[PDB]
Amino acid sequence: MKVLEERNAFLSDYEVLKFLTDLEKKHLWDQKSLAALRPYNHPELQGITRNVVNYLSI
Amino acid sequence: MFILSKIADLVRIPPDQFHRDTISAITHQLNNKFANKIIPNVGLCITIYDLLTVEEGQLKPGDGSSYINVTFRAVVFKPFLGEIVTGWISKCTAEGIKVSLLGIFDDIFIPQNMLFEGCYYTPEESAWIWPMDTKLYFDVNEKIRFRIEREVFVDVKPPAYALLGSCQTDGMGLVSWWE
């Protein structure tokens, strides 16, 4: 494993909020789909993915 | 506060998955190794933003799994030097304040040599006080605005990645103090 460039680009707060939000969809991790429901197993990715979102939306 | 990091690495895809979207499979293996995990001397990796390049899968003579060299980018939590970050006071130790980005990162420490000139600790109330003529209290669980000062890495308490913060300028400190 090699790092080609630690800082390749800034992801704006919004861009993150989006990407992480659209991500929870592909894997069914949204308020809506969570209550209407195996979704993607990954507990850690799902884990932090939610927290980052709950942060930028506050 | 967030960035992307161009990285390269070898992945191992099991025969049990050769029928899956090869690339979606790769991404899985990466999150498997990096999602919410630290990247040595870089920072906290949140997930893969995208894949950039993939080679051909070379098989091993011992197990039907093909190995693949991949170049990708990843969403990394790596506040920059000078940035003004907002978090919650998680603990007031006699030597400083510990901050948190609620579930994101807990290794944010603001030491006494970083607070306002005069700040002292109180083991009775369990908090740090700030004088100016008139006592202001950095209390537990209150949003804190702090400036990031040092980026501390350690090849691997102690944590492989931590950050030092400050509160020495108008506006920094407990948020309820300047809104």
Side-chain angles (χ1 to χ4, degrees):
Chain A
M1 184 263 291
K2 303 170 184 175
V3 174
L4 310 193
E5 55 193 65
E6 44 177 59
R7 297 193 146 224
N8 182 198
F10 303 92
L11 291 176
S12 84
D13 282 300
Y14 178 72
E15 298 179 2
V16 185
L17 186 56
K18 180 184 175 183
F19 172 93
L20 278 182
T21 250
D22 289 325
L23 178 58
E24 296 192 308
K25 291 221 172 187
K26 281 189 177 182
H27 306 303
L28 288 56
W29 293 333
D30 307 296
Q31 279 178 47
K32 290 193 174 184
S33 44
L34 266 188
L37 299 176
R38 302 177 186 172
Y40 192 56
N41 182 47
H42 228 94
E44 308 169 304
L45 173 52
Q46 179 186 318
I48 189 196
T49 306
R50 192 61 188 176
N51 286 303
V52 197
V53 194
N54 278 303
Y55 177 75
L56 303 177
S57 46
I58 272 185
Chain B
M1 175 188 256
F2 291 76
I3 68 176
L4 291 178
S5 297
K6 192 163 184 173
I7 295 177
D9 194 7
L10 175 65
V11 184
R12 170 179 159 296
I13 293 186
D16 307 296
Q17 302 179 59
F18 287 167
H19 63 290
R20 300 185 181 179
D21 181 306
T22 250
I23 261 167
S24 97
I26 283 179
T27 308
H28 175 80
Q29 295 295 307
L30 297 188
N31 281 295
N32 240 43
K33 181 178 182 176
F34 303 82
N36 181 58
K37 286 194 170 180
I38 286 172
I39 303 185
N41 303 315
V42 188
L44 175 47
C45 168
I46 293 185
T47 171
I48 296 66
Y49 188 57
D50 52 47
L51 295 180
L52 298 179
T53 62
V54 184
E55 294 199 66
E56 191 168 301
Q58 60 179 65
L59 285 67
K60 283 290 181 61
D63 68 317
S65 67
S66 81
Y67 287 57
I68 313 167
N69 279 301
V70 182
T71 310
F72 62 96
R73 306 155 83 193
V75 179
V76 184
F77 164 64
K78 177 165 190 165
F80 71 81
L81 232 50
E83 183 175 312
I84 292 186
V85 173
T86 339
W88 291 254
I89 279 168
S90 61
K91 197 179 184 179
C92 270
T93 205
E95 17 277 321
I97 311 176
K98 199 182 178 193
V99 189
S100 76
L101 297 194
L102 276 188
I104 304 189
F105 190 70
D106 287 297
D107 307 320
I108 298 176
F109 197 74
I110 292 174
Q112 195 285 163
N113 75 297
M114 301 296 220
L115 267 17
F116 291 119
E117 192 188 75
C119 298
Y120 58 99
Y121 175 86
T122 321
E124 308 185 308
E125 292 175 294
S126 177
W128 277 87
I129 288 173
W130 178 32
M132 52 179 286
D133 294 293
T134 324
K135 301 174 183 181
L136 288 175
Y137 290 43
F138 301 74
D139 242 306
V140 205
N141 297 303
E142 301 300 301
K143 296 184 181 189
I144 4 174
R145 177 185 274 75
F146 62 74
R147 170 182 177 184
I148 279 186
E149 296 288 352
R150 277 172 205 159
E151 199 173 58
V152 166
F153 300 75
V154 163
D155 208 301
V156 165
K157 298 183 180 179
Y161 177 66
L163 302 161
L164 290 176
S166 81
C167 283
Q168 314 186 292
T169 294
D170 292 299
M172 255 103 340
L174 224 54
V175 155
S176 84
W177 295 342
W178 327 71
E179 291 196 308

